[PDB]
Amino acid sequence: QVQLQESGPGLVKPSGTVSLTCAVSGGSISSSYWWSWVRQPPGKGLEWIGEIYHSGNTNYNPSLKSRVTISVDKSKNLFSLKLSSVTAADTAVYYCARVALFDILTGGWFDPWGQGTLVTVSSASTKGPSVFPLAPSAALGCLVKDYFPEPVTVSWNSGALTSGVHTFPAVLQSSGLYSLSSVVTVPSSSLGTQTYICNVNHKPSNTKVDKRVEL
Amino acid sequence: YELTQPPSVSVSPGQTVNITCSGDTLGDKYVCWYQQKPGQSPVLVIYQDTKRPSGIPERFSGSNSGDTATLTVSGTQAMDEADYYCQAWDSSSFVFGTGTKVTVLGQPKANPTVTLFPPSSEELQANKATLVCLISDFYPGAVTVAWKADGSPVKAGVETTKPSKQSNNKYAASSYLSLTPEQWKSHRSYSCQVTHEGSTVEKTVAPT
Amino acid sequence: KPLILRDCSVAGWLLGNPMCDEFINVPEWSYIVEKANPVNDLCYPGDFNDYEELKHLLSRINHFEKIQIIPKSSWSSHEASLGVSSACPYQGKSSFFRNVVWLIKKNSAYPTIKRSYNNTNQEDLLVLWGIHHPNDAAEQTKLYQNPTTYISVGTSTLNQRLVPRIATRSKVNGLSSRMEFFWTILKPNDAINFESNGNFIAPEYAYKIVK
């Protein structure tokens, strides 16, 4: 079986160049096959970038055409991707794929695919989170925003509060800093008789924040 | 060139589900289909409109005519729950469909519950303003969020999570509108519109 | 000057098979010769009718000149560029014979073609065309919306009617379908007539010959 493997820096600063390579094993780069790059921003659809043939012929996505370059190393048996002048819109999971032609007409199919590698575009460096309360008035929670890098672990009342708790995944804002929210669904009767404390932990910055949520 | 798919469809176990893909003169193009499980790579299920790769069960089949292509799964099992993308080629460019989430119903339907939080007093004194729209306890796990500033759509400063599994096996989602304190104080109303299974839930906050 | 084909057959070169690319600076010839066994005969698998008779004729001529009789852009009723195959690659992508046009459906329709070319030259014209025999019923519909199709080629000395044979064949160069090619000599005042509702491989370039 033929296998593809993506590798490269997972963090690139804005205006920088995303630089990736794809190692091909089980097959030769010199084939009747084409070698393609495809990206998928988190929680979104697949986007074709471009492709290359062992002879050097390329085809690019017209909207990325200005800043994209794909090349091939026959000796090391790999092909590579360079996407320049990057912005937050370039944060994506980057896949490489082998493309085969149809027996009749134009186009082709993608197989196999590599595992994919996440590339984040942010100028941020290690930063601790700010923690803000979401006051109910029922549901209440803690907003954990402007922290870099991931992850952030959240618990309530030092683990004593589990039921009714959901900690959401983080969004990467255009600023380059992550933000998530942890909410707990409680009976509306308990709001005046009971105290709720969220426990936020950011291990990369060694930040531990306890915030109480009131009415 | 764009390929349009329905955002989501649900189907009972054992029943048959049709995933549609639409495009200009799509019947003149060979269409391929890909299965993607969360956190994993796309998997080829159907290529060249009708063909199955070795290792794909006869359960899967596809067809193409006119401007619309269709992926078909018969007697679908739990393992068939995934995202499905159609694919074609036009004018020296490969094109992928918007994608369709297929849910096999393992539990009863649940209407979502939407809570909208205005910026906290503390954040406003930090010279920042963030609207938090929290969506929880709904099934199936597919939702579409839209933000309105004074009834006018805003795509700037909006970030939304993918629906995630709760402890009770329902699904939850979140959307953020990040603003500066001046922007948030420029409009008199903000809305979070959440559409789920043809039904639309809405919450509204206002600066004072 | 005599045309000596290094890697290509007469059929492949007349049809303009992409796999035979040999450097030709001067485009005038006397005659055509095939030596031993050609490396490439037909890139899209199929047959060439009356081939032996044609090779003898082209070695019997003292002047040979290629010319464009039916421009590929003159088909505004159909799709003349998208019909391509992996068995005939060019620069890694799918392609076809250069001198003959594979007509497929534009949008959801394949209107009936009535086209006539009158030889206005002072020389005999070698004209080539073909029929495509699709793999199955599904492929027929894919390429041409019309299930039941025909090709009529008239000349004062010829009456031909072809019906594509839809069948699955052995895979040659990756394809289970076939293409049959035909030729005739068009007299200096005579006109050739084409009619087809599908499966037609139309001429673009022809060859002026002198005995």
Domains of chain B: 1-106 (2.60.40.10), 107-208 (2.60.40.10)
Distance of CA C120 to the CA centre of its chain: 21
Render C16-54 in DSSP notation, one character per residue. T-TT--------EES-EEE-SS-SBS-SS-EEETTHHHH
Same fold, A1-123 and A124-215: yes
Task: Confirm or reject contact between A61 and chain B (CB < 8 A).
Answer: yes
B134 touches chain A (CB under 8 A): yes
Nearest to C6 by CA among C20, C25, C16, C26: C20
Q: Which residue among A132, A170, A175 places its CB closest to the CB of B123?
A: A132
C162 strand-pairing partners: C151
* CB pair distance less than 8 Å for C107 and B28: yes
Interface test with C, best of B25, B28, B51, B92 (most C CBs within 10 A): B28
- What are the structure tokens assigned to A71, written together? 């090349």
Measure the CA–CA gap between C103 and C129, rounded to whole angstroms.
12
Question: In angstroms, what is the C-alpha Rg of chain B?
Answer: 20
Q: Are C124 and C208 in contact (CB under 8 A)?
A: yes
- Burial bucket for residue C106 (CB in 10 Å: 0-12, 13-18, 19+): middle
| Secondary structure of residue A92 in the 3-state scheme | strand
Nearest-by-Cβ selection for C85 from A34, A54, A103: A103
Closest CA to B144 of B164, B173, B166: B173
Q: What subunits touch chain A, counting only 3 or more CB pairs under 8 A? A: B, C
- C-alpha dihedral over B87, B88, B89, B90, to 10 degrees? -110
Distance from CA of C208 to the nearest CA of A (A): 32
What residue ranges do the domains of chain A occupy? 1-123, 124-215
Residue A142 and residue A181 in contact, taking contact as beta carbons nearer than 8 Å: yes
Distance, CA of C93 to CA of C90 (rounded, Å): 5
8 A C-beta contact, residue C9 and residue C37: no
Find out whether B30 and A107 touch, Cβ atoms under 8 Å. yes
Fill in the DSSP letter of residue C150. -
Tokens of C116: 């006539």
Alpha carbon distance C175, B26 (integer Å) = 23
Contacts of A190 (CB under 8 A, 6+ apart): none
Give the start-end residues of each E strand in B66-198.
68-74, 82-90, 93-96, 100-104, 113-117, 129-138, 144-149, 152-153, 158-160, 164-165, 171-179, 190-196
* Selection from B168, B163, B103 nearest residue B135 by Cα: B163
- DSSP 8-state code for residue A195: -
Rounded to the nearest 5 percent, the helix, strand and coil shares of chain A are: 5, 55, 45
User: Does C82 contact A106 at a Cβ distance shorter than 8 Å?
Assistant: yes
CA A37/CA A23 separation, integer angstroms: 12
Resolution (A): 2.7
Closest among C36, C38, C37, C44 to C18, alpha carbons compared: C44
Burial C32-44 (b: 16+ CB within 10 A, else e): bebeeebebbbbb
Count B/C contacts: CB-CB distance under 8 Å: 13
Largest CA distance in chain A: 74
How far, in Å, CA of A35 to CA of B176, rounded? 38
Nearest to C108 among B27, B30, B50 (CB): B27
Give the CA radius of gyration of chain A.
23
Q: How close A175 comes to chain B (CA, Å)?
A: 10
Classify strands C3-5 and C32-34 as parallel, antiparallel or unpaired: parallel
Helix (H) or strand (E) holding A104: none
CA B35 to chain CA centroid, nearest Å: 15
How many alpha carbons lie under 13 Å from residue B17 in its C-beta half-sphere?
23
Tell me how far apart the alpha carbons of residues A171 and A180 are, in angstroms, rounded to a whole number: 6
User: CA-to-CA distance for B25 and B13, rounded, in angstroms?
Assistant: 33
Query: Strand A18-25 vs strand A3-7: parallel, antiparallel, or unpaired?
Result: antiparallel
Nearest CA in chain B to C107: B25
Whether residues B174 and A175 touch (CB distance < 8 A) is answered with no
DSSP classification of residue A128? P
Fold of A124-215: Immunoglobulin-like (2.60.40)
* C-alpha span between C11 and C47 (Å, rounded): 10
Torsion of CA C160, C164, C169, C174, to 10 degrees: 90
Nearest residue to C180 via CA among C129, C144, C112, C105:
C129
Three-state secondary structure string covering C66-83: EEECCCHHHCCCCECCCC
Distance CA C144, CA C136 (A): 12
Q: Where do we find the tokens 């250069």?
A: C98
Q: Given 2.40.440.10, 1.10.510.10, 2.60.40.10, 2.10.10.90, which CATH number is that of A1-123?
A: 2.60.40.10
Q: Tell me which chain B residues have a C-beta less than 8 angstroms from the C-beta of C105.
A: 28
**B31 vs C contacts (CB less than 8 Å):** none
For each of the domains in chain C, give its residue range(s) and CATH number, in order of start: 1-211 (3.90.209.20)
Residue of A33, A113, A166, A175 to mutate when probing chain B, most B C-beta within 10 A: A166
**Which residue of A161, A168, A174, A211 to mutate against B (max B Cβ within 10 Å)?**
A168
B27 CB neighbours in chain C (<8 A) are 108
